[PDB]
Design a protein around this ligand. Structure first.
Ligand SMILES: OC[C@H]1O[C@H](O[C@H]2[C@H](O)[C@@H](O)[C@@H](O)O[C@@H]2CO)[C@H](O)[C@@H](O)[C@@H]1O
Ligand SMILES: [Cl-]
Ligand SMILES: [Cl-]
Ligand code: NA
Ligand code: NA
Length: 551
């Protein structure tokens, strides 16, 4: 569990975590409370992993786009500043961290990518993407290259993809339409095609990552890079005389970076929420606190009005805000995780040659729009439903044990198990949730009820060999591609927020109420006894199920 009486903070290792630790030093000087600042890798994935178990940091720093999913998963405490504090930060930064009407983090700073260029190699940087191929030819004749930036993270390639028409989710009169994705329209294809052709023509290398591009630019090997304000400090340390300016245009349109608001959330499981609010409001989000972080690694245009009025005089910040104004604030909706994962795969596969731009973006378009109903269909698609029903039909008319038990299912005892199971408020909750997700679960269960109510079957010739109730389950499980299920299950938790959210709804279900249902109902107990009496390990089933959901 989270340790009480201290603060543990997670922030990405490219940010000013040493400056943040200096703020932690002042907090301890004043209060006696110790602050630990960590910067683990894959922070945006590590936090929901550990926080879901009730563990993790008291405070989590990341761009705001990830926080709606965290909040939906119940990982974040509501943020309720007093009026005077709220007024100290720009309204549009509070907007970035508002989800379902509640504030779910403190906004810190506005981040936008810019074009960073070597003034000595390139006194006049290009205004267009289209002229960069020729510039690289010219620079290649001098032992240099034109442009290197991180091609492993779609954050860096999105501004080009969006320039001539690409978009994540369509925004209209208030809301984002998570069914209207814009990653495979003509503008998106054109932008990614231009990136891939830069690689095909050897103006960039598909394996270039953050560290490679940073080293190349700061050691004077490449004339340009694309990065955010956090990167300026290392460039300062280098010998490079650099400028920060507007991103290049594509087809006459501005590059459109997805703008992030670095935000600080409080772990819902933290026993230190009051200390975290004091640290964030009265130590970090002050002129002195943000200056400490900013002098370590620049934050960008900070959310704090008083200090942004100083930083705004910096031409590098002017360029950051110019690029931000030409881009768009990221959504914070949970579906952003699907979007980023889909475009990540598309860019890497297209840049590697593994796929064409058209095929990679076509797959990303469908993946970014993933919905629970679509995910469920992929599981059904794996199941031979024709065969499963025939086994059930053969057993229903041919197998002695199956008939015995099917007959039991038509008595009062099971009728009461059935009516009482589906009267539980915990079960009705799941059914309505599925109906909200456009899965006709009531219709499906009433199809099962109509079948359990069967009194006559069409004539058929019986099968000669059946193996009782255990033989029925062995024969039907044998038709289930169980490895593919567990694989598909693992991918969907990564590619589909709605699938994860449904699993979380079951995981976080009040499992006790079901044990109450069992331990207090004689009809339920009998039902379970009968199953065991036919050789069916019901206990090994429930226990295995409880493990699946962590009950
Ligand atoms: O590349 C996808 C990734 O983009 C953004 O992450 C940024 C982050 O916002 C910046 O602060 C900086 O650290 O670079 C990261 C990209 O490497 C999204 O915020 C993130 O959720 C998304 O996965
Ligand atoms: Cl990287
Ligand atoms: Cl359906
Ligand atoms: Na307060
Ligand atoms: Na094309």
């Amino acid at each position: 569990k989270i340790e009480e009486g201290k603060l543990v903070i997670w922030i990405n290792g490219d940010k000013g975590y040493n400056g943040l630790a200096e703020v932690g030093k002042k907090f301890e000087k004043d209060t006696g409370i110790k602050v630990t600042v960590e910067h683990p890798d894959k922070l945006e994935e590590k936090f929901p992993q550990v926080a879901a178990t009730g563990d993790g940091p008291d405070i989590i720093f990341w761009a705001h786009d990830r926080f709606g999913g965290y909040a939906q998963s119940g990982l974040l405490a509501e943020i309720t500043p007093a009026a005077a504090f709220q007024d100290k930060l720009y309204p549009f930064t509070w907007d970035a961290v508002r989800y379902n009407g509640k504030l779910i983090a403190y906004p810190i700073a506005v981040e936008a990518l810019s074009l960073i260029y070597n003034k000595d190699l390139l006194p006049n940087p290009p205004k267009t993407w289209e002229e960069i191929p020729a510039l690289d030819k010219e620079l290649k004749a001098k032992g240099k290259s034109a442009l290197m930036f991180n091609l492993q993270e779609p954050y860096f390639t999105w501004p080009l993809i969006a320039a001539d028409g690409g978009y994540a989710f369509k925004y209209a009169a208030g809301k984002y339409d998570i069914k209207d994705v814009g990653v495979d329209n003509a503008g998106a294809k054109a932008g990614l095609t231009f990136l891939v052709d830069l690689i095909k023509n050897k103006h960039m290398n598909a394996d270039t990552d953050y560290s490679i591009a940073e080293a190349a630019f700061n050691k004077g090997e490449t004339a340009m890079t694309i990065n955010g304000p956090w990167a300026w400090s290392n460039i300062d340390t280098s010998a490079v005389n650099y400028g920060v300016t507007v991103l290049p245009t594509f087809k006459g349109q501005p590059s459109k970076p997805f703008v992030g608001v670095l935000s600080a959330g409080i772990n819902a499981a933290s026993p230190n929420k009051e200390l975290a609010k004091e640290f964030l409001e009265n130590y970090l989000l002050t002129d002195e606190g943000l200056e400490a972080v900013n002098k370590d690694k620049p934050l960008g245009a900070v959310a704090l009005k008083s200090y942004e009025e100083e930083l705004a005089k910096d031409p590098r910040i002017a360029a950051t805000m110019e690029n931000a104004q030409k881009g768009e604030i990221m959504p914070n909706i949970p579906q952003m995780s699907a979007f980023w994962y889909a475009v990540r795969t598309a860019v890497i596969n297209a840049a590697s040659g593994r796929q064409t731009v058209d095929a990679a973006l076509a797959a990303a378009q469908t993946n970014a729009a993933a919905a629970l109903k679509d995910d469920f269909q992929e599981f059904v698609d794996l199941v031979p439903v024709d065969k499963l029903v025939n086994v059930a039909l053969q057993y229903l008319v041919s197998d002695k044990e199956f008939k015995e038990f099917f007959g039991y299912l038509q008595g009062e005892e099971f009728s009461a198990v059935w009516d009482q199971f589906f009267a539980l408020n915990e079960v009705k909750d799941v059914l309505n949730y599925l109906e909200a997700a456009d899965l006709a679960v009531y219709d499906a269960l009433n199809t099962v009820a109509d079948f359990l109510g069967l009194h006559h079957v069409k004539p058929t010739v019986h099968t000669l060999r059946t193996g009782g109730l255990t033989g029925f389950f062995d024969e039907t499980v044998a038709l289930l591609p169980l490895d593919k299920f567990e694989a598909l299950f693992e991918e969907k938790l990564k590619t589909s927020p709605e699938f994860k959210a449904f699993f979380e709804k079951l995981r976080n279900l009040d499992y006790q109420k079901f044990v109450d249902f069992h331990n207090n109902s004689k009809e339920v107990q009998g039902f379970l006894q009968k199953l065991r009496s036919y050789g069916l390990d019901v206990d090994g089933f429930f226990n295995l199920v409880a493990g699946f959901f962590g009950w």
